[PDB]
Write a protein that binds this ligand. Sequence first.
Ligand SMILES: NC(=O)c1ccc[n+]([C@@H]2O[C@H](COP(=O)([O-])OP(=O)(O)OC[C@H]3O[C@@H](n4cnc5c(N)ncnc54)[C@H](O)[C@@H]3O)[C@@H](O)[C@H]2O)c1
Ligand SMILES: NC(=O)c1ccc[n+]([C@@H]2O[C@H](COP(=O)([O-])OP(=O)(O)OC[C@H]3O[C@@H](n4cnc5c(N)ncnc54)[C@H](O)[C@@H]3O)[C@@H](O)[C@H]2O)c1
Ligand SMILES: Nc1nccc2c1ncn2[C@@H]1O[C@H](CO)[C@@H](O)[C@H]1O
Lengths: 485, 485, 485, 485
Amino acid sequence: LTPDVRNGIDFKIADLSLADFGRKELRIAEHEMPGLMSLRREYAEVQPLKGARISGSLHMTVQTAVLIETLTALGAEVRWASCNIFSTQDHAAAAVVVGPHGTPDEPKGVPVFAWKGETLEEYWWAAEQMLTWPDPDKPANMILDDGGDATMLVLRGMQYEKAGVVPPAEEDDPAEWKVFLNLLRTRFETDKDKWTKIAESVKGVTEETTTGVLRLYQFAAAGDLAFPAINVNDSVTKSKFDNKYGTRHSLIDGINRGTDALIGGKKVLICGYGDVGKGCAEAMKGQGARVSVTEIDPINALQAMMEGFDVVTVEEAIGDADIVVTATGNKDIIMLEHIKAMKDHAILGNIGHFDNEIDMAGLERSGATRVNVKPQVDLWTFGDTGRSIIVLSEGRLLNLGNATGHPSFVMSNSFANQTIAQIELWTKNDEYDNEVYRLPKHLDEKVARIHVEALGGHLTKLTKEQAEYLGVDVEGPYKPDHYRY
Amino acid sequence: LTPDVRNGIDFKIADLSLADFGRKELRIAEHEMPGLMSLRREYAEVQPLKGARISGSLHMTVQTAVLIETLTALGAEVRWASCNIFSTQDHAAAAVVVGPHGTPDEPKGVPVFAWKGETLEEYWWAAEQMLTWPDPDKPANMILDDGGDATMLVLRGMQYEKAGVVPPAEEDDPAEWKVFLNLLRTRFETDKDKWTKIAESVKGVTEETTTGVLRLYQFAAAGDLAFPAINVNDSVTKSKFDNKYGTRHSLIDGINRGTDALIGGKKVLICGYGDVGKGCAEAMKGQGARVSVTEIDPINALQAMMEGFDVVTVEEAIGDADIVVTATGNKDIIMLEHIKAMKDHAILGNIGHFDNEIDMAGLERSGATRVNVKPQVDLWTFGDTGRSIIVLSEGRLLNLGNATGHPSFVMSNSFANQTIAQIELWTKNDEYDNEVYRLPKHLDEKVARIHVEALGGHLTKLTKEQAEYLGVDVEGPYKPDHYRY
Amino acid sequence: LTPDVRNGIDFKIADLSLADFGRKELRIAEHEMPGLMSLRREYAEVQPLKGARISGSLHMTVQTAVLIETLTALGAEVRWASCNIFSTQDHAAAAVVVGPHGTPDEPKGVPVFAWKGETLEEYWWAAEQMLTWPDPDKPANMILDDGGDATMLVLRGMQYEKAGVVPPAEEDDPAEWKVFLNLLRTRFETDKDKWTKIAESVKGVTEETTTGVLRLYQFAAAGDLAFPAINVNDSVTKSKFDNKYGTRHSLIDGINRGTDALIGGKKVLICGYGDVGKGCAEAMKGQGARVSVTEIDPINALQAMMEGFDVVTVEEAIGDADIVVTATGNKDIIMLEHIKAMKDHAILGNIGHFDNEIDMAGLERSGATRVNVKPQVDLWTFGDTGRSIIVLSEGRLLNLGNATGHPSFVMSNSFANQTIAQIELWTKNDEYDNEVYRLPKHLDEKVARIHVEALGGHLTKLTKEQAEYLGVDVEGPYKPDHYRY
Amino acid sequence: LTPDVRNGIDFKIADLSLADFGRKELRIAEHEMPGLMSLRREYAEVQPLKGARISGSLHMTVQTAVLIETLTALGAEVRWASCNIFSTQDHAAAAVVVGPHGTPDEPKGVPVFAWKGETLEEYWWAAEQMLTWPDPDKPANMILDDGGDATMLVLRGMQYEKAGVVPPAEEDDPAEWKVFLNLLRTRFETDKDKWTKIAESVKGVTEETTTGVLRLYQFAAAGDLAFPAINVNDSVTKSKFDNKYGTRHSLIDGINRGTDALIGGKKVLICGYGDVGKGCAEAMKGQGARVSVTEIDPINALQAMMEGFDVVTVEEAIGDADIVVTATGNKDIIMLEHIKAMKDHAILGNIGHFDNEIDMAGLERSGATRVNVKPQVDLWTFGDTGRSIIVLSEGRLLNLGNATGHPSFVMSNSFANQTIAQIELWTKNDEYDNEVYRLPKHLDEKVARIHVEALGGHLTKLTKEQAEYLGVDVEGPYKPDHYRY
Ligand SMILES: NC(=O)c1ccc[n+]([C@@H]2O[C@H](COP(=O)([O-])OP(=O)(O)OC[C@H]3O[C@@H](n4cnc5c(N)ncnc54)[C@H](O)[C@@H]3O)[C@@H](O)[C@H]2O)c1
Ligand SMILES: NC(=O)c1ccc[n+]([C@@H]2O[C@H](COP(=O)([O-])OP(=O)(O)OC[C@H]3O[C@@H](n4cnc5c(N)ncnc54)[C@H](O)[C@@H]3O)[C@@H](O)[C@H]2O)c1
Ligand SMILES: Nc1nccc2c1ncn2[C@@H]1O[C@H](CO)[C@@H](O)[C@H]1O
C-alpha cells in the first residue's frame, strides 16, 4: 500500500473526483459552523498556528474537513487520518486533498489518508502515514486526537523502542491489537527511533472524546505521558452538547439508514446513561419507543428513572428488546450469550467509541452465519435457535458508520473547543506540564455565546448591581468551577 | 420509450441486477409487516382475488413490494407503477419483477414500470403501461390508488373520449396537466374507446391517501365515479397511524439524508396540523426543535396550542424559520414571495401529496439560480439578497424522495387495510354502488389487534357483565361509529 | 333535611359567609372563560333562553358557577345541584346563591343544593330539590345533566309511577341505588304523578359526559327516551379538549393535594386509553413517570404503544405499580383481589365517572382497616399482608374530589358547548325527535376559534382559490363529518 | 411575642391540635423517604450526633419534620425555625413539637418556632429563638442552614459586636434588613457578646441551597468564616435532583393551588436556566405550555435552545407572558415597569430563594391597589392601565408558599445529604479547616443507590475486567471528580 502523490501532496483516499460534491457540502457546513467561522475571522491576521505541524486523528467527515481548513486558515500544516474504519465520508476527504481553490488535477489541500471501509491493516498504515511527516528534521509537533490512537501509536511506539523490543501478541489478543503491534514490529526492524523522535517533537495533544481522555489519564498516572494534553471532551460545550445533543441526532439517523425499522412502539434498550446514553434515550423516547436503560452508576441510573426509564440489567431485558444500543465506553456489554438471547430480527448497535462493547469476536467465532445486507448492515443467523439478529457497522460506532455522525451545528461546538485548544497549547506551550488540562470556563462561554447568537437567542446582560450580587463579572465567568449545568 | 420483456413479463425499472439486495430487504420487511403476513396465512387457501387484474399506482418501495406479493399470494394478477417520480426504491422494483424464485434473466415476478428519478413524460408513460393490460379482451378490473392518478387517467380519459375531443392546455397549466393531456390526445388519435373500455372493466378502486380521497369525493359529487371506491385513508388504523406516526418517523429521515442539518435548537414551521403535520411537529419537538404551526381550522389549531406550539401565519413566521415544512394537502402555501423572505440557508420541503404546496413554478421563473447538491437536494440563490434556500425533492414528498418513506411496520397497517379493501370489493362487488365507502370498524380493530400482538401489547378481555355494561360484544366493535380515538 | 330561604331563594349549601372568596375567584374565572364571555355578549340583548327553567345537575364548581351566571344572563331560571358527593366548591356554591350584586343576608342569586361531602342520602335529596320547581303547573322544562343522574331520576321516576310498584332494591345493588329507590318510594306515598308531569314538562337535556351519553343511548335504544337530547361530550371542542387536556391538568393536581407523592420515577398504571386515559398518561409521562396502560380496544392500545407506553393487564402489573388510575367508564377494573396484590403505600384512584371502577364495596366488606388521613384521603391496611394502600376520594372521580377538577380555560370549551346546545334545544324544539343528537361542525369550530384567538393563535385565511381546491367554504366547516382530528 | 411552653418544651406555632394530622403525614412520608430511614437504621445504635445541639433554619415541612426526627434518632438535640414566612406546614410543626409518642398535652418533641404567614419581625424573632439555647453554658454547637439566614444572624451579629456598634439602616433599604438590624441593635443593648459566644461554639454549618452557598462563599472569601462549612446544595444528589426534579414537581403544584390556571397552551416565561429553571421549564412543557427562557449565561442559554425553548429578554417577552416565573437566585429580574408591562390577569411568581427577584418593594410603593384573593394570592390593580396581575406568595418561593414544596421522595435525597453532612462535620470535626466543603462522591453514590433500590431499578455490577478497563473499583466511585452528570 503506497500513498498517491499529486501536485506535491501525498494522500490515500477513495476518489478524488468526489471533491466537487465534497466542496458543496463543506460550504453548506460553514454556514452551520459559526464556531469555526468566527475563529477563522478573529484569528486570520494573527496566524497563531504558524509552525504547527498537526497530525490529526479524527473521523474524516464534512464537519472535520471544516476544522482542518480552519486550522490551515490559521497558519498550520496538517496531515489527517480517520480514527475509525467506517467513519470517513469519502467526498469530504476528496474535498480536503483538493482544498477550496484546487481541482483533482491541481490539488491545493492537505495530506489525507482515509476512506470509508478500511481494513484494520489499512487503518493502521494510514494512521502511520498521518503521523509520518515528509521532512525527517520536521516531524509532527502537535496531535489532534479522537480516541487516542495517534497518541497510543507514538507513546507505545517510543516505549517499545526505549525497551529495545516490540513484544509479540497472544493468540487471543484483539485483532486490532495484533495489527498494531505488527506495524510497530515491522517498522522497528527498519527504523529504531522513529516514535521516540516524534514523541519528542510533539508539543501537545488535544483529545476529543471520553475513551481517549481516560487513556490520557491512564498514561499520565503511569508517568508515561510525554507532552501536555488538553482534555477537549470535558469542556462543557463539548460533553453536554456533542455527546448528548449530537447523539440525540445521529443515533436515530444511523438506525434509519441501516435498517429503516420503526422506532415508535418498539422496546428499546440503552446501555449506559452518560451524555451519550442520555441523548440516545431521549432520541428514542422522542420517537415513541419504550426505553429502558442499563447502568452501573447509581447516580446516572436514578437520573434515568426520574426521566421515565426503567433501570434494568442486560440479563433480564435482552430477550424482549427490539433494538439494543451500547453507549458505555466499557468492554463486554453485550456478550455472545446475550446475542443468542435476542428475539428474531432484533437490532443490535454500538454508539460507544470502540467495537468491544458488543462481543463481535465471539459472534464472529460463534458459527453464526452472516449475510451482508448492504454496507455496514449484516444479518447474523444462529443455527440452534433459527433466529437472526441485524448488527450495525460490525459493532462500530453506528452513527458515523451507518450515517454521517453528528450534525455540523453540533460539531461546531466540539471543533471550536479543539481549535482553541490547539491555539492555546501551541502559543503558550511553556505554561503547561506533561499533565492533562481542561479549558478555562470563559473560553467555553465564548464557544456557547457564538452558538446562541447564531441560533438567534438573546442573552441578558447583568447590571452593575446584579454582578456584585452574584459576585461575578458582567462578562463572566458566571458559574463556580465545579458547576455541573 | 419501449418496455423490456423477459420471460413473458413486460416492465421498465432501473436495474434488474438489484434483485438480490431487493429480496433481502423484502424478507426483512416481511418480519416487520405482520398485517400482510397474517393476511397471507388466512387467505392462502381461499384465493379470494383469483380473476382479479389489479392495476397499481403507488410509490414503488420495499413496503409496496410486500403488498404486491400479498396480492399475488391471494390470487391477483398485478401491474405496477409508482405514483411519484422520486419515491421508487430501485432495488424493490427489481425484486418485484424478479419475484421470490425468479432471477434477473428468468424473472417470475410482476410487471413494474417505475424507477427513481422519472421525468413527467416517463411517469405518465409508466402510468399508462400499468393500466394497459395485454389482451384487450381482459383489461384492468381493479385499481389500487395512492394520489388518484390512475383513477384520474381512466376517468378523464373516458370523458375526453365521450366528448370526442381531448382539450388543449392553457398558457400556464401545470406541466403535469400538460404532459397528462399530451398522453391522452396522442392516444386519442389511435384509440378512441380505450379509457371508456378500461373504465367499463373496473369493478372498484381502493384509495390510500387524503388527497386521493378528496378527489374521489369530487368525482362522485360531479356524478363521474364509474365504479365503487373504498377510502382506505380514513380507516382509523390508516389515518391515525400511518399519516401521523409514519410521518413522525419519515419526516426527519427525509431531512437528515437530504441535509444532515441539526434539528435541535432550530426554529421550525410546519404548515397544517392534521395527522401529517401532527406527526411532523411531534417529530420535530422530540429532536429539541422550537416548533410553530400554521392552520386554517381552529379545532386543529387549538390542538396545536394545547401541545405547546405557537399557531402563527407564514407571513409572521417565514423570515425566522430554520426549517419550513408544508403538510396541508392544499396548494399555495409557500409562495415565491415567502421564499424570498426566508433566511440564508433555511431548508424548505413538502411532505403533502403533490408539489404545489410550495411555489416551485414561481421559484423556477423567478431568476434565482439553482445548484444541484446531490439528487433531490437543490440550493436556490437570490442574487438581489444574496441568500440561499435548500429545497428538498423539488417540492415533492420529501420522505419518499429524500429517504425511504414510512417504515415497514407502519405501512403494514395501511397495506392490510389495502388488501382487505381489495378483497371486499372483489368478492362482494354486487354489494357496492358508485360511491366512496369506508371499511367496517371490526376490520379496523382486526388490523390494530394484529400489530398490538406483534409488539407484545396485551389486550385485556371484557367479562360478559362488563360488556353488557358498555353495550358491546366481548369481540367488538368497542366504540360508536362517530368515535374519534 | 329542610331548605333554607332568603329573599325568595331556596338553597342548601355549606356556608354563606363564603360569597366573598367565591366572587373573587369567579371574576378571575370569567377572564379564563372567553367561550362563556363571548356568549354572554352575543346573545345579551336577545335573551335566547327567555322562559326556560333549567335544572342543572353538574359539579358545583367555580366554572359551573360562570356557566350558571351565563345561563341567567341569557334569560333562564336555574336550579342547581352537584352531580357528585365530593366535587362541590363551597365558596362557589355560595357566590351563585348570593349573586354578582348581592349579600349573604340579601342573596340576588339562584337556588343551589350542594356542598362538599354529601351522604348518598343528602346527594339524592339535593338532586330531588334541584329538579323540584316551586310554581304550578310550571316545573322543569330543561335538564342540563352530567353523568345522567337527573335524567335517570326523572325517567325511571316516571317509569315506576306508570307501573304503580316502586320495586324493592336487591341486596347486591350499590348503596347509591338503594338510596335512589328509597327516595322514589317515599315520594310515591305523597305524590303519585310527580315525575310523569316533570318528564312531560322537560323539552330536552344536554349531557356533558361520556358515561351520561352511554346511558342516553341505552335509554333511547329502549324506546324509553322521553324527550330530545344533545350529546355534548362528543363535540370535538368538548371530548378532545376537556376529557384529554383538562385531565392532563387535573389528574396530577388531585394526586398532589391528596398525597403530595413524587410522580417522577414512579411506575404508574393507567387503566384505559381513551381521551381521559390519554390525558392521564400524558400528564404522568410529562412529570417523569414510568407509565403503563391497559386496554380492551386494540386501536386505543396501538396508540398507547406508539406513544411509548407498554400495554399490559392489571394482573401483570398491579404488583409493581406505585400509582394506579382507572379511566375506563366501565365497572370492575380493580377488584379487591387486585387491591390485595398492590405494593405497600401504593396509591389508588378513579378518574372515570362513578366509584365502581374500583371495587370499593369489595374493600369495605373485606376486613382491611380504613384510617382517614384527611378529607378524601384514606389509608387501608390488610392485616394478613401488613400492606396499606392510599385510596383517593373513596374511589370517586379523584380530580374534582381531591382538588378542583379541570381549569376554567378548559371548562370554557365544554361549557360554551353546553350553553349553545341549551339554546338549540330551547329555541328549536320542533326540529328534534326523541333521539340523541350532536352539534354541527361550524358550532364546534366556533368554540375552538374563540379559544384560539384568546390564546393568541393566528389562523390562516383560505384564499378563494384554496377553498375551491379543498371543496370547502372560506368560513364554513373544514372537515368531513367523520373526521377524527 | 413570647414562646409558649408545655411540658418543658418552648415553641411557637399555629395550632398544637394539628399533631394528629401531622403525624399521619409524617408516617406516610417515612415510606417515601428511604434515604432518611436507611440512615436511621445504619446509625441509631451508633448515636453519631450525641451532644450535637443543632439550630436548624429550614422550611418547617412534613419533609423537614422527618429530617428533624432522623437527627434525634441519631442523638441530636435540635431547635428549629423555618427559613421562610409562608413555607411552614402548620400540622408538621405541631407534629414535631409533639414527637412520635407525645400528645398535644404531653408533647415529647423538640423546640419549633414557625407558622405559615409570619411577619418580618415575627420571622426574625423565631430565628432568634431557634438560635437561642437555654443553659448559656450550652449554646448551639451546629447549624443546618437553608439560605444562610442563621449563618448571617450569627456572623453579622458578631461583626457588629466586635465593632461596638450595630449601624443604622436607611429609608431606602430592603425591609427585611431594617428588621434584621432592629433585632441585632435591640439585643446589643441588653446583651453585648451573644452572637460572639454563639459564633464560637458552632462546630460547623450545613448549607442546603444555592443562594445560601453563594453567601457562604461571600463569607469565606473575606476571612470571616469562623467554622468548617459544607455546601450540601452542590451534592449531585441534591442540586441535580432537588433543584431540578424537585421543582418539576412543586412549581406546577404551587401555581395550581394558587390559581387553578390552565398551563396548557399558555405562554410561559421562565427566568433563569440552572437546575431550578430547568425543572420549571420541563414541568411547564410537560403540561403543554409554550415556554421561553431568559438567561445571562451563554452555556445554560444554549442548553435551553437545544431543549426547544426560545432564549429571550424579559423586556422583549414580558407583554405576552401568561405566567412568569423567576429562578435566577438574583435580584431585580422583574421590575415595576415589567409588572406594569404585563397583560391583564397574567400570573407572576418567584421560585428562587429570596423575594427580591421580583420588585415587590416598588410594586407596594407603586400606588397599585391590592385585593387579597386568599392566602398567598393577591390581585394587584394598576389604575392607569386598568390591568390586574396575580402575584403568588407576595413574591416568596411560591412552591413552599402556595403549596407544599418538593415531594418526600425528592427531599429524601437532599436530606440524606444533610444528615450525612451533619454526621461528618460532627463525628469527624478535626479534618476540616474553616472553608466551604463538599461531600465525597462515594457518599453521593450511596444516596442515589438507596433510591434506585427503593424505586425497583436494578444496577449492573462491573466485572473485575471492566472495573480495570475503566480504572475504577467495582464498588465506586465511578466518575472523575469534575464529571457533571
Ligand atoms: N458516537 C459518537 O458520536 C460519540 C459521541 C460522543 C461520545 N462517544 C463515545 O461514547 C462513549 C460514552 O461516552 P459518555 O460521554 O456518554 O461517557 P460517560 O462516562 O458520561 O457515560 C458512560 C456511562 O456508562 C456507564 N457504564 C460503564 N460501564 C457500564 C456497564 N457495564 N453497563 C452499564 N453502564 C456502564 C457509566 O456509569 C457512565 O454513566 C465514550 O466511549 C465516548 O468515546 C461517542
Ligand atoms: N424553590 C425551591 O424549592 C428551590 C429549590 C432549589 C433552589 N432554589 C433556589 O433557586 C435559585 C436558583 O438555584 P439554581 O440551583 O438553579 O442555581 P443556578 O446557579 O444553577 O441557576 C441560576 C441561573 O440563573 C441565571 N441568572 C443569573 N442572573 C440572571 C438574570 N438576571 N436573568 C436571567 N438569568 C439569570 C444564572 O446564569 C444561572 O444559570 C436559588 O436562589 C436557589 O436557592 C429554590
Ligand atoms: N372544574 C370542573 N367544573 C365542572 C365540571 C368539570 C370540572 N372538571 C371536570 N368536569 C367535568 O366532569 C365531568 C365528569 O362527570 C367531565 O365530563 C368534565 O367535563
